[PDB]
Structure 1
């Protein structure tokens, strides 16, 4: 693509997301989702292989279906209230339609099937954008309409997301599919506390985006998309694999790392609401994510896999480009737990 055209398409994706987050009118929110999808489709097809084309097609189908359901929910809400302002929904079935549409856009468990395939089918930069920036708009809408969501529907979808992200990621040797299933589990963690405290959702989203940015930038730095290709990285740049190991430990929520903060805060906020069984289930289920994170860490940094003879060529060469803000992303994703009370700034 033309660098100017790619910059414009990226800016249009972000501007659709911003239109979603700054509008008080449902039509403009729908417009923002539309603009985001329109600009997003070409960045998925940037490399243009049949895998990229299929990933873009599946993404388009799911997002367009969700957008039509969202518009139908808006129209039912208007039919019963005459209201365009994004606020509590005045109709229950419109609320159900909207919740399902937003979950399908996010990729929650009953609508999760697109996330692994699309993430695998696109490049690591496209996947980084897909699993970080594309979560903002639906989650912001959900935080705005949280006072009218059905807690049972939302909590069901979140628990299923955690379970499926844990189980699906257990079987993966592809790094992009592992990232997608980790993303499903983390979206479940975000959406479980959404009925109770949207500040916890924002906190968890920020921590997850930091970890995902760090991990995807480490993968791009490594040029690895399979677990065996990553197993060669120690023999080229062991610093990258050790940083990746501490980041994976953070993703598993191991104290004293930054990834433990969202789980701990969400468990506390849930127990404040007489919710004890669900947090226990969620914390226990996250051990699956931690298991395949630990498998990746074993294959990458904690042990040394066989290398190749052609790796001696790569030793005499440096990186042409350097990932921006990667050291900051790594420090933020691992070391920020002592700063937890600053979460009140998100209030």
Structure 2
């Protein structure tokens, strides 16, 4: 498209998210969600193909259903108390409607089915945007009303999301579907600590966004969307594969990498509330995510796969376009564990 129109649409998406974040009226939050959805579709359809159109229509159907459910929750809450301010709901039914709408918007299980398909259909930059920026508004709304949520429902959906992400990632050869299932598992981790501490939710969100940005920019740099395409990168850019392996190790939650910071903290927080069984199951299930991250690392950087003859020509050229923030993203996603107490900044 035209760069002016693309920039306008990106700023409209950001302004919708911002509208959701800064407003105190439920109508304005709904309007921000509508603005975000309206400006998000052409970004998903920036490169025209049938798969992108299918992904965009599935995404629109899901998000529009979620928006209608959210407005139903708002109107019921207004009916049982003539209040428009985003605060504790005051109605049991309204809270459930709101929780399901936000779970559908976030992609939490059992509303996860759209995330892998939409991520696979759209390009890598669209997937980066969808998996990073599109989680801020629903999570901010959830943080604002965390005192209202029924812990049973939120924790059930969190554990279901972790299990579904772990199991669904094991069966994937496509990199975008792997990222989608990883995002589902990380959302499950994020929403299990909302009833207890929203600061841990925000810390997990920030760490996950950093790692996802690094991984997507590495996948864009070495333009691969499959396992076998990524297996060719060592024969041109071995340093990229090494950085990707370290980032994958971090995403699996291994100490002393940055990815260990959230789960640890979250587990720690959940222990202060006499919740022992649930964090144990969450860690055991995160072992599945680690397994398929390790399989990707085996296929990419820890072993040398066969190459082709035409690769020689690619040896004579270098990238024209570069990401300025990719080194910073890699460093922030691998080596910030010593700076953990800085989480007191209420990030």
TM-score (norm 1): 1.00
CA shift, 1:299, in A, is 0.3
CA distance in structure 1 between the partners assigned to 2:72 and 2:239 by the alignment: 51
CA shift, 1:91, in A, is 0.5
- 1:135-177 per-residue CA deviation (whole Å, 9 max, x = no partner) reads 0000000000000001000000000000000000000000000
CA distance in structure 2 between the partners assigned to 1:250 and 1:42 by the alignment: 33
- 1:261-283 per-residue CA deviation (whole Å, 9 max, x = no partner) reads 00000000000000000000000
CA distance in structure 2 between the partners assigned to 1:43 and 1:109 by the alignment: 25
- 1:288-337 per-residue CA deviation (whole Å, 9 max, x = no partner) reads 00000000000000111001101001010000100130000000000000
RMSD: 0.5
CA distance in structure 1 between the partners assigned to 2:229 and 2:194 by the alignment: 38
CA distance in structure 2 between the partners assigned to 1:184 and 1:304 by the alignment: 30
CA shift, 1:15, in A, is 0.4
CA distance in structure 1 between the partners assigned to 2:77 and 2:335 by the alignment: 45
Consecutive unaligned residues of structure 1, counting only runs of 5 or more, are none
Aligned to 1:214, the other structure's residue is in SS state helix
CA distance in structure 2 between the partners assigned to 1:168 and 1:99 by the alignment: 24
Aligned to 2:147, the other structure's residue is in SS state helix
CA distance in structure 2 between the partners assigned to 1:324 and 1:218 by the alignment: 12
CA shift, 1:48, in A, is 1.1
- 1:188-221 per-residue CA deviation (whole Å, 9 max, x = no partner) reads 0000001100000000000000000000000000
- 1:13-42 per-residue CA deviation (whole Å, 9 max, x = no partner) reads 000000000000000000000000000000
Alignment of 1:1-347 (within 5 A): 1-346=1-346
CA distance in structure 1 between the partners assigned to 2:315 and 2:161 by the alignment: 42
Aligned to 2:64, the other structure's residue is in SS state helix
Aligned to 1:110, the other structure's residue is in SS state coil
CA distance in structure 2 between the partners assigned to 1:250 and 1:346 by the alignment: 23
Aligned to 1:305, the other structure's residue is in SS state coil
Aligned to 1:146, the other structure's residue is in SS state coil
CA shift, 1:341, in A, is 0.1
Consecutive unaligned residues of structure 2, counting only runs of 5 or more, are none
CA distance in structure 2 between the partners assigned to 1:284 and 1:198 by the alignment: 23
CA shift, 1:183, in A, is 0.2
CA distance in structure 1 between the partners assigned to 2:109 and 2:147 by the alignment: 22
CA shift, 1:46, in A, is 0.5
CA distance in structure 1 between the partners assigned to 2:346 and 2:122 by the alignment: 33
- 1:65-107 per-residue CA deviation (whole Å, 9 max, x = no partner) reads 0000000000000001100000000101000000000000000
CA distance in structure 1 between the partners assigned to 2:238 and 2:25 by the alignment: 51
CA shift, 1:52, in A, is 0.1
Give the 4+ runs in structure 1 shifted more than 4 A.
Answer: none
